[PDB]
Structure formats: structure tokens, C-alpha cells
Design a protein around this ligand. Structure first.
Ligand code: B12
Length: 596
């Protein structure tokens, strides 16, 4: 029989004879009077088997993508006959019937200002494997375009993705706009920057229709099936409503229960250094920017941290095999991890040897001094105490009250730079790297129909950007700044943060203000030197880009600012010479007080 062959090819992921079997079944008009039967019947049966096996955890994500590719080739062979049948019937009967076999239509988009779509692509493929008609809209999607896509495609669900905290404001804007046209379509929320608490507190109240946060792609199928089943729709919505009300009440009680120090008191208990006895800062080999136009990708292959790459494919090894290279020894996901790693190495070799990917970056150093909570940068030949700063990076100090038994100070990034009045020269660095050509390769793979290769190339581009950042930080410590000239740590120690100094990035918990990237881009001329541009929400395009600041102090360390009070917001607005509303917008996730 041909149905068994179709199901076996779908489940196992064999495109070798899928065209032949599909054509053979199509020619068997006895079983299938219309080609819709080959879709509604044997083909979606294998897709459903794959989807439920993935939901149960027996089959892993890469095999799901293989099955999706096989199904895509099958439907691609079938769609000319679908078009022929529809064109014939439009003239024979004058009408087009409801021939939809999918469970529902879902508009899937990444909100404006965000350029990350690996998770959105994975979610779309997973949903498509469960007979959902996924409508992927891309990145930096305007809200009006999402609403128009939902209206034109008679969509049933809308999904929003976002990776940076400025995307949360866009998501809330989309929710309230959906409310403004009185749309009743359920709205799912996903992304690395999203959380269950933020959705119920901020996103959920703005929309009357269901708004559900989804942690991963596996839960997305369950949520969509429950939302599209009328026997479970209202009860699931009510349960979501009660749990979100409970979490909102708990959130407000907590917010009443937190204590914060006064800003002056927090400053008085900040981190201190003995600059009169600590070793003096090491002057960099140059003051200004050194631009890299075409970095050696082969040097970046051995600097790649593969654990986030295996986290992309959801191949999470159990203890003690939870990380590379021990993941290959795991009983369950060892074979799939090995297959994915081999494919990644093959594609990396092909792209590097063909010059299909280019890495560009810039690193700069300037004299820097500290004035309370700010780091001021000066010219090369200018005396810091008698010259105007050419740039300033404003820091945020931890304000949340700590445990009485705790003795840790209240950290700020300016604590790692020598104060101006101390009479000690100090310097600060910054960098920005990227991997160029991932977008075109992903588009080419998606046009062919290989979503697996597109996801692989996106993950490899991100890995290459991270490896470039790590290697450049290694060079800065030993060669360009030479404050750690005796460093000889291996890449394993590099991934363990065992070296001197730190490289905080804007938007991270050390300094969660994304507007710090504008100063770097204006100072180091990053967009003109390397081609990396900031979007409207201060995200780096291409998405395979990493930036940050270089702190060479021995005592410097990574810290989380946490929640801050109103007074720190007012002081930050006064220092930055911007309105309080802008500070609250760019520091919304770290506000310890309500704003509405
Ligand atoms: C490696 C990594 C990167 C990658 C991002 C990977 C990518 N492009 O997908 C890169 C190298 C680009 C990077 C850069 C930066 N990152 Co980053 N990064 C990480 C990290 C460690 C991995 C998370 C991740 O992306 N996994 C990959 C995908 C598969 O996971 P996911 O997006 O969560 O997708 C899943 C689910 O969320 C869900 N899902 C996703 N979308 C949708 C949509 C719908 C509808 C549904 C139903 C489900 C759904 O399904 C997916 C499958 O599981 C996280 C830490 C963390 N724990 O989240 C930080 C994190 C996401 N990074 C963040 C930040 C700070 C940045 C930067 C701004 C820092 C910088 N260099 O300036 C830049 C971004 C600018 C840029 N580069 O263009 C923040 C978030 C923003 C913030 N705090 O303001 C995080 C959370 C770190 C942090 N603690 O602050 N980073």
C-alpha cells in the first residue's frame, strides 16, 4: 500500500521517494476522488502522529523539522493539482468551496524593532506540524500590518514574539490596538524577554479577549488546540482569567512588600576601592578605534560555545550529561545531538570555505573617569580634570534593600572606574561585532523549503557572533589593552568567566538601559566602520551582533541592578537631561513602583 509508505516517510523524514509515492497515490483516483483526500487523509495523519509524538517528548525537534520538510515537499508536489482543480471548478460551478484542511490560521510575527526570529520560526514549524496554517510575518512587523494580515487571512490566533525589553512596550501597544478595533481573536505572547507575570499584569488587562503567555513551542500546540476547541474554549479562558487575577493580586501584594533604600543612602553604601593602593590602570596601546573589515572565521570556530546552540534545538541533556561535549553521551538525545552537531559543522565548513559569511567589528579605547554614578570619556591629549568630556555613560546603582546578614555593597558600573578627583588616569573600552550574510542564506534556504537549514544557519550565525565577541575580548585583554598580558587561559576557562575584567552590554542586568548603545555608536562610529546599525528600538541589525563596554578593573564583576525607586529615576533623568517618562519607558522592567 502507498498510505503506509507515505506515513513512514512522514514520520521517519524521508524525502528520497516522497515525490514518487505522492504521485502514485494521486494516480490512484479510486481511493482519492479529489486530491484533497490525499491531504485530509494520509498526509495529515502522519503529521498528527509526528506532532503528538513530539508533544509526548518521544520525538525531538530536529526530527520534527525533517517531517515538516517531507510534508512540505509532498504538498509542494500536490499544489499544482490543487490549483488546477480550483481553476477548473471556478468555471465549472462558479463557486469556490470551503476546502481548508488545516485546524486554523495563526498569524505569527515579531514586533517592531526586533530582528530575532529563531524561536518564532521554530514555533511556526512546530504548529505547522500539527495541521495549523502558520502565517509567518517576519521581523520588525508594524502593528497595523499584523492586524491587516489577521483581517485578510481570517486568522484564528495571533502570536507576538520579542527578544528585547523594548519589544514589551510594542506588545502592549499591539494588545491595546487590538482592543481598540474591538477584535476578539485570542492573542498569544512569547519571546525570551516575556514572562508570565508581565503578561497578566501589563499585557492581559489591556485586551478583553484571551491573552495567554506561552513558554515554548511545545506548549503552543496545547494552547492553540484548547483555544480552537469549543468544548474547551470558555473553560480554559476562565481558568486563565482566575490564574492571572491571582498572579496580579500576588504581584501587587509583593510590590507593597518590597523595601528600597534612599538614593543618597545607597550611594553612601556603594562599592569602594582603594585607588591610593591598588595598581594603576594600564593605558591601552592606542586611543581611538581599530576596525576589522574581514575577520578570519576559521579562527572563530574553536571559540564557539555549543550549549546555547543545543538549547536552540531543545536538545537538553539530563544530568550529568547536560552540556557539550557530554551531551553526546546521553542515552536519549545523544544521537540527535550528534546528528545536529555534524550538520552544523558541515554547514560551517561550507560557509567559511566559500566566503559566504563575513565578520566585521570595531574596538575602541578612550580615557575615562568617574563622577559619582557616571563615567566620563575624554580626548587622547586632554587632561581629565581640565577638559570637557567627549562622552558619558550613565550608570544605575542597586537600590533594593538587602538582607541584614548580607554585606555586599550597592553596585554601579561607575564603581569600576577611577574617580576624577582621585588624580588617577583610567581608561574604558567598547566593542561591536557582527556576522554578515545570515539573512540572505536563511532566505535562500527558506525559499527552497529547508527550514532545518535556515534554523541551522541562524543558530550558526549567532554562535559565530558570540565567538567573535569572545575572541575579541581575549585579544583586548592580552594585545590591544595588554592589562592581562600573562593570560593564557583556554576557551573552557573563557566560558567560565575566569579572566580579568568584564564586558557588560547595554540592556543586560548590569545596565539595563538600551539607550547606552547610542553613545557607543556615536563615539566609535560603529555603523559606518562595520555596518552594524541600530533599529528604532535600539536593536542591532543584523541579529547576529554583539556589543558592550570593556572594564579592565580587577574588582569589576557582573551584577543585577534589580528594581529601583522613583528618586533614582528622577536623578537619572536629570543626569541624562531627558524627561522622566523616557527614563520610565527605557527602565520599565526594573521599576520598583507603579506608574499608572
Ligand atoms: C544567546 C542569546 C543571545 C542571542 C539571541 C538568540 C536569537 N537570536 O534567538 C544574541 C547573540 C543575538 C544575543 C544578543 C543580545 N541579547 Co541576548 N540572550 C541570549 C539568550 C542567552 C538565549 C535565549 C534565546 O534566544 N534562545 C533562543 C530561542 C530558541 O529561545 P526563545 O527566543 O525564548 O524562543 C522560545 C520561546 O520563547 C517560545 N517563543 C518564542 N517566540 C514565540 C512566539 C510565540 C507566539 C509563542 C507562542 C512562543 C514563542 O518558543 C521558542 C522555542 O522554545 C538569552 C537568555 C535567556 N535565558 O533568554 C539572552 C537574552 C534574550 N538577551 C538579551 C539581550 C539583553 C541581548 C542584547 C540586547 C545584548 C547586546 N549585545 O546588546 C543583544 C540583542 C541585540 C542583537 N544582538 O541584535 C536579554 C533580553 C532583553 C533585555 N534584558 O532587555 C536576555 C534575556 C539576557 C538578559 N538576561 O538580559 N543574545
Amino acid at each position: 500500500p502507498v498510505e503506509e509508505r507515505l506515513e513512514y516517510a512522514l514520520v521517519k523524514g524521508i524525502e528520497k521517494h516522497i515525490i514518487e509515492d505522492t504521485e502514485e497515490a494521486r494516480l490512484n483516483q479510486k481511493k482519492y476522488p479529489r486530491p484533497l483526500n490525499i491531504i485530509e487523509g494520509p498526509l495529515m495523519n502522519g503529521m498528527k502522529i509526528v506532532g503528538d509524538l513530539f508533544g509526548a517528548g518521544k520525538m525531538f525537534l530536529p526530527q520534527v523539522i525533517k517531517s515538516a520538510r517531507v510534508m512540505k515537499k509532498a504538498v509542494g508536489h500536490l499544489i499544482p493539482f490543487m490549483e488546477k482543480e480550483r481553476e477548473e471548478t471556478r468555471v465549472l460551478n462558479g463557486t469556490v468551496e470551503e476546502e481548508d484542511p488545516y485546524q486554523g490560521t495563526i498569524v505569527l510575527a515579531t514586533v517592531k524593532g526586533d530582528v530575532h526570529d529563531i524561536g518564532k520560526n521554530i514555533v511556526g514549524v512546530v504548529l505547522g506540524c500539527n495541521n495549523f496554517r502558520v502565517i509567518d510575518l517576519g521581523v520588525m512587523t508594524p502593528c497595523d500590518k499584523i492586524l491587516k494580515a489577521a483581517l485578510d487571512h481570517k486568522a484564528d490566533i495571533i502570536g507576538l514574539s520579542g527578544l528585547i525589553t523594548p519589544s514589551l512596550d510594542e506588545m502592549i501597544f499591539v494588545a491595546k490596538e487590538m482592543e481598540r478595533l474591538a477584535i476578539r481573536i485570542p492573542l498569544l505572547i512569547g519571546g525570551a524577554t516575556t514572562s508570565k507575570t508581565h503578561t497578566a499584569v501589563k499585557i492581559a488587562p489591556r485586551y478583553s479577549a484571551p491573552v495567554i503567555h506561552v513558554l515554548d513551542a511545545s506548549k503552543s500546540v496545547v494552547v492553540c488546540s484548547q483555544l480552537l476547541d469549543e468544548n474547551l474554549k470558555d473553560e480554559y479562558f476562565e481558568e486563565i482569567m482566575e490564574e492571572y487575577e491571582d498572579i496580579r493580586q500576588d504581584h501587587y501584594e509583593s510590590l507593597k512588600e518590597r523595601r528600597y533604600l534612599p538614593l543618597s543612602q545607597a550611594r553612601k553604601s556603594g562599592f569602594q576601592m582603594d585607588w591610593l593602593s591598588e595598581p594603576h590602570p594600564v593605558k591601552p596601546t592606542f586611543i581611538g578605534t581599530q576596525v576589522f573589515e574581514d575577520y578570519d572565521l576559521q579562527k572563530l570556530v574553536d571559540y564557539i560555545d555549543w550549549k546555547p546552540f543545543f538549547d536552540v534545538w531543545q536538545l537538553r541533556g539530563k544530568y550529568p550529561n547536560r552540556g557539550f561535549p557530554k551531551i553526546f553521551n546521553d542515552k536519549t538525545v545523544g544521537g540527535e545531538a550528534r546528528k545536529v552537531y555534524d550538520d552544523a559543522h558541515n554547514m560551517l565548513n561550507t560557509l567559511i570555505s566559500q566566503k559566504k559569511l563575513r565578520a566585521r567589528g570595531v574596538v575602541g579605547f578612550w580615557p575615562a573617569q568617574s563622577i559619582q554614578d557616571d563615567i566620563h570619556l575624554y580626548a587622547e591629549a586632554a587632561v581629565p580634570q581640565a577638559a570637557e568630556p567627549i562622552a558619558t555613560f550613565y550608570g544605575l546603582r542597586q537600590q533594593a534593600e538587602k538582607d541584614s546578614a548580607s554585606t555586599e555593597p550597592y553596585y554601579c558600573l561607575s564603581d569600576f572606574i577611577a574617580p576624577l578627583h582621585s588624580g588617577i588616569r583610567d581608561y574604558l573600552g567598547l566593542f561591536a561585532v557582527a556576522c554578515f550574510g545570515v539573512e540572505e542564506l536563511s532566505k535562500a534556504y527558506e525559499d527552497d523549503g529547508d527550514d532545518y537549514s535556515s534554523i541551522m544557519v541562524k543558530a550558526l550565525g549567532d554562535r559565530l557572533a558570540e565567538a567573535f565577541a569572545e575572541e575579541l575580548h581575549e585579544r583586548v585583554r592580552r594585545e590591544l589593552w595588554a592589562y592581562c598580558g600573562s593570560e593564557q587561559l583556554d576557551v573552557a576557562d573563557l566560558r567560565r568567566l575566569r579572566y580579568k575584567g568584564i564586558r557588560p552590554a547595554p540592556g543586560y542586568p548590569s545596565q539595563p538601559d538600551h539607550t547606552e548603545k547610542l553613545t557607543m555608536w556615536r563615539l566609535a562610529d560603529i555603523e559606518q566602520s562595520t555596518g552594524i546599525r541600530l533599529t528604532e528600538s535600539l536593536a542591532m541589525a543584523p541579529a547576529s551582533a554583539v556589543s558592550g563596554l570593556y572594564f579592565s578593573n580587577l574588582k569589576s564583576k557582573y551584577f543585577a541592578v534589580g528594581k529601583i525607586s522613583k528618586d533614582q529615576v528622577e536623578d537619572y533623568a536629570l543626569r541624562k537631561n531627558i524627561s522622566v517618562a523616557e527614563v520610565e519607558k527605557w527602565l520599565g522592567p526594573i521599576l520598583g513602583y507603579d506608574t499608572d
